[PDB]
């Protein structure tokens, strides 16, 4: 219960050579915090500014680590437990996990697990692109939400299941389909329209659309513009609000709002609120689920 | 042998429900091109800026058909013919294929296919990706190669395989590895670099990098930053080089150049240079073999 203590992340899952471990000085922090928790995490391909924004959701200008290269930045998955600026007695944990997609890792497996921990872990979701919803991306979330249910295994009045929040950045393109204006969650819904028909595709199309849209109880989309620009992109974090586009400030202040007002707490399959011990133990049970047993 | 006669693109390949199909108006008229043929096909995500490039390399500013909302723009493929910059008597034959990843159409198998097709009937193929390669991208690209085979033969003197160019859109990062500055061409080498030792996995990683070195006889990588700005970018074939961020203008003159000088013609498993009427051929034999018998 104590005094905003988290002066900056730390790793939670350490990922070495396709061996996922839990930190023990994480761990013993979670043990610590006895306060209900609100977690959220990110995912998303490599270097597509996931922990930038994952700090705004922290306030600081300074605290997940960033990097301006080619090369994976962010590795394994980190935690960052803050007072909830919207919940009292609450505590707002935050995820950062390590990119997807990194061509010198090329470890697809590897990715499914952190991928996976990270939505077996939130509350809400965070699903982080570039420019626009793919297939790819959106047969991806379905894979992982199977293999989630797999995990669960080795280890309906009102789920437990998180909530998803599909984020659009460096956004450029007009935003409308079929001649008719869209809201990014029109868009994504669009996107998750299911097949009117039946056929051997024709379903198996809205097959992942199903189950997508019934593993996340509630659903939200939000695009952001590219931040500052070309030049500066290396340097975001040392810049405030006044370099940066207008636009993109005002999108981030309207994602936090909704991440600050509408996640729920974390909930144990029982009701059970979630809180810094459920946590570590969910944590190990999982980590532990996964490696060891097929 | 005509006075350069292609006003604008013409729909090659035609995509409706499932059903790739050779347009005849097309074919008409690869029958009357005599001349031996440089074929450059461009291949990436929708919404990415390839038909956009694809007329740079026209040289005309208006041309492929560009559309600029969160929806599927070109559909099937395209072929522009038109009289070689820097070949005399030579026909540089562009194709722009219909972007990949659309969301409404959700077919891989379908994507397969263009992608397929577009390898095939090029000498050059050209990878069009933003910000950085993926192993997602990497590994659709692997897929497709050995795809190639299986087409081919239901249809090593200096090969006949298409040289390969990663073009690099809206790029936004530093570009070096390992504290150790980076060339687009480097990066893109160190991206299929391969694993130095032996394992279960330690193979099954640079298992593609070594088919996707071995297919492309010729590789190549160029980086673009971000043409003009959001605002402007729906609008993107009017403004002309002024209005444009020079970088853009540079590495796209650089990329045409490149284009121009080094693209091989077109040579079927025998020698024999491609043109006109042997293109019509290629074409019919691959889509009546796609389709049809699997
Ligand atoms: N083009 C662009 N760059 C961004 C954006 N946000 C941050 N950046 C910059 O891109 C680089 C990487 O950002 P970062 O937040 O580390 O992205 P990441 O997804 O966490 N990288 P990784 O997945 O490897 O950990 C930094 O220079 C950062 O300032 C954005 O929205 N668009
Ligand atoms: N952000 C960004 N936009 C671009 C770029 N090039 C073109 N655009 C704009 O993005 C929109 C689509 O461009 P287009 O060339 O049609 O892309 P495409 O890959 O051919 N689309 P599709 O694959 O669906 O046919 C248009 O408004 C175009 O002006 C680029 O390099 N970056
Ligand atoms: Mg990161
Ligand atoms: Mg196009």
């Known amino acids: 219960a104590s005094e905003i203590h988290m002066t900056g992340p730390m790793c939670l899952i350490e990922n070495t050579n396709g061996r996922l471990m839990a930190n023990p000085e994480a761990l013993k922090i979670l043990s610590a915090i006895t306060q209900p928790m609100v977690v959220v995490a990110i995912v998303g391909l490599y270097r597509t500014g996931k922990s930038y924004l994952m700090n705004k959701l922290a306030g600081k200008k300074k605290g997940f680590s960033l990097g301006s290269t080619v090369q994976s930045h962010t590795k394994g998955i980190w935690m960052w437990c803050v007072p909830h ?3 009292p007695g609450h505590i707002l944990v935050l995820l950062d996990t390590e990119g997807l997609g990194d061509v010198e890792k090329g470890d697809n497996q590897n990715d499914s697990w952190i991928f996976a921990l990270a939505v077996l872990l939130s509350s809400t979701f965070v699903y982080n692109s570039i420019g626009t919803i793919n297939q790819q991306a959106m047969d991806q979330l379905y894979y992982v ?3 989630t249910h797999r995990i669960r295994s080795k280890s309906d009045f009102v789920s437990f299941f998180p909530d998803f929040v599909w984020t659009l950045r460096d956004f450029s393109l007009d935003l409308e389909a079929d001649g008719q204006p869209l809201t990014p969650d029109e868009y994504l819904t669009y996107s998750l329209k299911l097949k009117k028909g039946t056929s051997q595709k024709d379903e198996t199309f809205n097959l992942p659309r199903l189950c997508i849209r019934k593993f996340f109880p509630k659903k939200k989309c939000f695009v952001f513009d590219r931040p500052v620009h070309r030049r ?43 809180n810094g011990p459920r946590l570590e133990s969910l944590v190990l049970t999982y980590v532990n689920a996964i490696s060891s047993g097929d």
Chains 1, 2 share one sequence.
């Open 85 to 87: 600026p919207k919940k």
């Open 232 to 274: 500066k992109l290396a340097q975001l974090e040392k810049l405030q609000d006044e370099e940066l586009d207008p636009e993109f400030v005002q999108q981030v202040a309207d994602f936090c709002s909704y991440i600050f007002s509408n996640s729920k707490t974390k909930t144990l399959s029982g009701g059970i609120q979630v």
């Open 145 to 147: 939400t199977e293999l």
